[PDB]
Each structure stands twice: as C-alpha cells, then as structure tokens.
Paper text:
The apo-structures of mSPSB2 and hSPSB4 show some additional differences in loop conformation. The most significant change affects loop B, where hSPSB4 Pro79 and Val80 are displaced relative to the corresponding residues in mSPSB2. However, the orientation of the adjacent hSPSB4 Arg77 residue, which would bind the third Asn (hPar-4 Asn72), is essentially unchanged because of its largely buried position in the β3 strand. Loops C (e.g., hSPSB4 Thr111) and E (e.g., hSPSB4 Trp217) are also somewhat displaced relative to mSPSB2, although their overall conformations are similar. Again, a significant rearrangement of the Trp side chain would be required to accommodate the peptide ligand.
The [name] domain- and [name] box-containing proteins, [name] to [name] (also known as [name]-1 to -4), contain a protein interaction domain known as the [name] domain, which was first identified as a sequence repeat in the dual-specificity kinase splA and ryanodine receptors, together with a C-terminal [name] box motif. The presence of the [name] box motif suggests that the SPSB proteins may function as part of an E3 ubiquitin ligase, with the [name] domain determining the substrate(s) for ubiquitination, and this has been confirmed recently for [name] (Z.K., R.S.L., R.S.N., and S.E.N., personal communication). The structures show remarkable conservation of the [name] domain fold and absolute sequence conservation for positions in contact with the (E/D)(L/I)NNN motif.
Author numbering:
A (entry chain A), B (entry chain A): 33 to 152, 157 to 233
The structure:
Amino acid sequence: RPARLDQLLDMPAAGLAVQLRHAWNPEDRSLNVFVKDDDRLTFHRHPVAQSTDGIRGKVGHARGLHAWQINWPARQRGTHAVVGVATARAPLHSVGYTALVGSDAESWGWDLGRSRLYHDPGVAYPAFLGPDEAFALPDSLLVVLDMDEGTLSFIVDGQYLGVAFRGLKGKKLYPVVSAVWGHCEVTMRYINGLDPE
Amino acid sequence: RPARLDQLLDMPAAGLAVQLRHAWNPEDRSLNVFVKDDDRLTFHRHPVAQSTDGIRGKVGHARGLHAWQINWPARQRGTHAVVGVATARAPLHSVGYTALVGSDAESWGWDLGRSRLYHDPGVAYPAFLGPDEAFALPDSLLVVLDMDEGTLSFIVDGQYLGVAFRGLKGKKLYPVVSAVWGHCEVTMRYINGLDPE
Ligand code: NI
Ligand code: NI
C-alpha cells in the first residue's frame, strides 16, 4: 500500500527542529522511563520489579501519511518489545510483564521479538512468516502511519513489509513504545509527513 | 540424528544432586556473572560498560550422549544471547558486545536471538529457516551433546531441530553460555546421560 510513500521518502528527511517537536513526550510516559537530559530523541527505561513501561510521542496524528524511524538495538530487545501507535487513553505502565501496546482497544503494536501484532489478538507479521517463525530485525525500522487511509505499516532495511493494521480513521494516534526488560534506550526520529490539502 | 536420544529422554530426569554436580561452575566464569547464593543452578549477569560474559558448567564431557535444559526467559534475551559448548580454553569475557561463544576454534554456539550458529561463521539453524528469519524460541530449550558421534543439537518444546555442529570427537566440552545485555538469569538443569560401555 505505498500510496504517497515513495514521495514521502524521496523528500529530504526533516531536520532537528521538526524531529524534536515530534519526539518522545517527557510528560506522557511511565513514571519508570525518562527522556535523556542530553538527548531529547531517546528515552531510557529504568526498571523496578515486574513493570511494563511505555512512552508516547508529542504529536497525535489525525491526518496525513507519516513516517518515523525507531532505533532500538536488537541486543536490548526480546519478547514484548513493542513498537506502534496509541490513543491518548492507552495505559503507559502496568505491574508485570505484558504486551501493553496492544493491551486494549486504545493501542496497536508490533512485538519486535515475537513478530506478532497486538490489539484488542496475537497475529503474525510480516504475513509471509510461517508458524514458529520471527522476522530477524536490525537496530532500526520505519513506522509508516497513514491516517488518511487509516493503516499502520513498517519498513525494515528498505523493504516495505505490508499493512499491519487497518481501521484507524477518525482517531488521533501517537508514536508509542512499550518495553519489559532491561535499561533499554529507544531513539525516535520523525522522518517526514505529507498532510492533505 | 536421535540415536539413543529416545532412550535418554525416556529415563526419569536426574535429581537435584546430579543436577548440582553438572551445574554452572562458580569458579569458571566471567568476573561479571555470579552463581546465585540460594540457587546454584542459576547465574545472574551483573554488567558494567561494554562487556560480553560467559560461564562454563562444572563437567567437561569427553564421552556419552548428554542432555541439559536451559531456562532463559525470551524477555531477557536478544541478539548475541548464545547457548552452546566450549573447550576449557574458551575466553569467557570480552570488552564489547560479541558472539563470544563461537568466537574462535574453542567454542560452538547458537544465538537464540538471531537463530545463527557461531564457530571459527554465521550459519542459519534450524536449516529450514529462510533468509531474514529466526525461530521463535520459548523460555527453555534442550542442549543435546553427543561426544560419541561428536555432534551438538537442540530440542525446543518437543521438536528435535537437527544436528547443529559436527566434528566434536576427541575434545572435552562443557555446557557454556554468553550474554551481552541486561541482568539476565540463565538456569541449567542436567537432564541425563548415557555413557558408553
Ligand atoms: Ni537505567
Ligand atoms: Ni544484577
């Protein structure tokens, strides 16, 4: 479904000021993660017993085709390391280890460890993966949000991987992430957007 | 290649005394992991900057078909989380993040995150995985060592996954593990062995 995606990716990527406006929101997060003091593009998870922790981006998209880059080293990431989008009503912390992005009707996510899609559950993505199989992801991916068609999809190392979710029109959705393990650091860079007329 | 493997697995599993004799060696380890004070079957990794840390089991096998169970929650595990076997000469620490089990001629390992086999490199396992694919492992696996035929293989949730390495006759090889990330806890239980006559 890359509609104006080739156009969006041909644009020079947005510079630092736009990247920062679209970045992790230091005031819309689990009490157990923080945006770093010298890198406002990167949050750090700082755990205590049995917690799943999330953070939303500053901008909720009701509109346009948008693309952002997530760096999460593969090393720092196992199961229930989820990348996706969420309503402003998605719980951003839980007690225990869960798929919190995708927990309820308020969030949609891709488990980078399991290659499974979450939303209320447990569907495989990319669809060409077989049973007991996972896509071997590198340190970064692209999250492609289309609030005009109402879909979510991902690119990894140049490959468009398919539409992951549909039915997202009429909502306002932010870059979100949730992690269950370790002192992870997840960078996000807004790449670009094409707004409607 | 399950030769006497069906016989080995039909035996009642070894009890706690045998499990402990075959367990992690608190004196054959990276200075940055420790065997837990109240659980001598489990090591805990306790990191500092840029380190890859290993631990070997107490018993080096020159002989027999042997099987042990590794519990490493999937959550606590990404790339360069390696399970395997090593000569008594395998480095058990490095400065930086590497595939240290499989680093040189002295060790053989399976990256649970990448589904790749290491030894000197980078081969896929199970072989039926395609390009860019990984096997989605659960919290535990079986390491099956055959020092009579000289092979290493793995079982996951009842499925024998194939011979991973060959050419291991004439050596003495220990359960080994290396981890690069987080405060992982890896349990190992020796399951059983069939010695030759
Ligand atoms: Ni921390
Ligand atoms: Ni620790």
